[PDB]
Design a protein around this ligand. Structure first.
Ligand code: YHC
Ligand code: ZN
Length: 419
């Protein structure tokens, strides 16, 4: 199941390095997402993990035989990670003012794969980083406890604000900012204060008991299907901020057309609109000038909005992984939210036909497997949350979710099994 989520697939050399230096035979999907984006795209990342964090930033410099810099204020934990790396035959060291001249020389020569430094040491030694980059090449800079750069976080540190010059001093080096807080507002501050460019955001390890899951059959008559979600007001509206994800541009236009007849505060978003009208819809939704966005998969990434109360997939989703990213945008404030899929067998027939249009054979098989998992989820009588967590989350999140599973607030299948 985990291997199906890996896109693209790791090669043999990547797998051999993982077994030899990290004692693992396979990458976890979130680990692979960060690692692949660093190695192949030199992309900045924000990795939010609630508790295998170290592999994300330790594996890429070890694989390419270069240097990964790790910035952290947790001195004892850095010393322990240095020790664990050495026990696995990985040259690593903690570099600070008390280090020997002989150690800095081997760092300068590219003999150490991972170098741990405090933020204060890093701030006062930028020229050394420019020298390491020009002579050896820095694979990445990891910034641990990254929430410390935020003034509205719970642990602001003066030593962190100076890390905003890393991107200017080393423009080609990707930064992997790591934190254990899933706060949406702290994440936007991490991105801004570190000067990250189009960062890949990952967020994993958290159970989300505030997300109610439901799958229901459609009639195709749009208003008949959406009426149960609507509240007559003086016009009509949803309970709160809502996203309606559709499988095509035409469906976004038809759904928007029906809600516009009701004078509902809404806007359409798809990749066929002009840049200015897309920016307008995005801005109006985050400023709460519109309550509902009717969109294709093109809408969602980079949306800093914690109070999405409802996600509706109007039509069977085509891809299980995309569905997971989309529902993950609901209730980031921790308050009650709902994620509903309204589907019909005809949506699955059409989704399957469009899959034949993917010319790359390897990508078509990956998308076919994401589609088959989505179809199994839709037709299932089992707990929806159990299925989702089994595909995407670790055993501790699965174990932690056992409290909500089986109860009236879990999913539609737990509610039906109850009575
Ligand atoms: C889906 C991952 C996720 C997120 N993302 C949303 C999608 N995304 C982007 O849009 C995006 N991707 C790339 N680059 C940029 C710039 C982007 O914005 C990546 C981050 C995301 O933003 N958050 N926020 C949290 C919080 C957890 C606790 O504190 C509050 C907030 N957790 C997440 N997760 C994990 C999550 O949702 N798992 C989960 C657990 C149970 C169920 C269920 F079965 F029970 F229903 C369903 C799901 Cl999906
Ligand atoms: Zn359930």
């Amino acid at each position: 199941d985990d291997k199906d989520f890996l896109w693209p697939a790791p090669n043999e050399e990547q797998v051999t390095c993982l077994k030899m230096y990290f004692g693992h035979s396979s990458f976890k999907p979130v680990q692979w997402k960060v690692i692949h984006s660093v190695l192949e795209e030199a992309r900045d990342n924000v990795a939010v993990m609630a508790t295998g964090k170290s592999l994300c930033f330790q594996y890429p410099p070890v694989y390419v035989g270069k240097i990964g810099l790790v910035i952290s204020p947790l001195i004892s934990l850095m010393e322990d990670q240095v020790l664990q790396l050495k026990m696995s035959n990985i040259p690593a060291c903690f570099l600070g003012s008390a280090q020997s001249a002989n150690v800095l020389t081997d760092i300068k020569l590219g003999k150490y794969r991972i170098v741990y430094v405090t933020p204060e040491y890093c701030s006062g030694n930028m020229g050394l980083l420019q020298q390491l980059e020009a002579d050896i090449g820095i694979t990445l800079i990891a910034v641990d406890e990254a929430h410390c750069i935020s003034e509205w976080g719970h642990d602001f540190r003066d030593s962190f604000r100076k890390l905003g010059s890393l991107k200017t001093a080393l423009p080609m080096v990707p930064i992997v900012a790591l934190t254990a807080t899933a706060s949406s507002s702290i994440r936007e501050d991490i991105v801004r204060c570190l000067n990250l460019r189009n960062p890949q955001i990952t967020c994993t390890g958290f159970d989300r008991p505030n997300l109610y899951l439901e799958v229901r059959r459609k009639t195709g008559n749009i208003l008949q299907d959406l009426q149960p979600f609507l509240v007559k007001t003086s016009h009509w509206e949803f309970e709160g901020p809502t996203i309606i994800y559709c499988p095509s541009r035409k469906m976004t236009q038809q759904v928007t057309g029906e809600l516009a007849k009701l004078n509902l505060s809404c806007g359409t978003y798809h990749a066929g609109m002009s840049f200015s009208t897309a920016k307008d819809i995005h801005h109006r939704f985050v400023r709460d000038e519109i309550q509902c966005v009717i969109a294709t998969i093109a809408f969602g990434m980079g949306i800093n909005k914690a109070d999405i109360r409802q996600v509706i997939h109007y039509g069977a989703p085509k891809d299980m992984e995309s569905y997971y990213q989309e529902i993950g945008r609901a209730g980031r404030d921790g308050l009650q939210s709902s994620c509903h899929v309204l589907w019909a067998p005809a949506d699955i027939n059409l989704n399957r036909h469009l899959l034949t249009e993917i010319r790359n054979a390897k990508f078509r098989l990956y998308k076919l497997k994401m589609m088959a998992k989505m179809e199994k989820y839709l037709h299932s009588s089992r707990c929806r949350r159990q299925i989702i967590l089994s595909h995407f989350e670790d055993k501790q999140v699965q174990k932690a979710s056992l409290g909500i599973m089986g109860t009236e607030k879990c999913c539609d299948n737990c509610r039906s099994a109850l009575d």
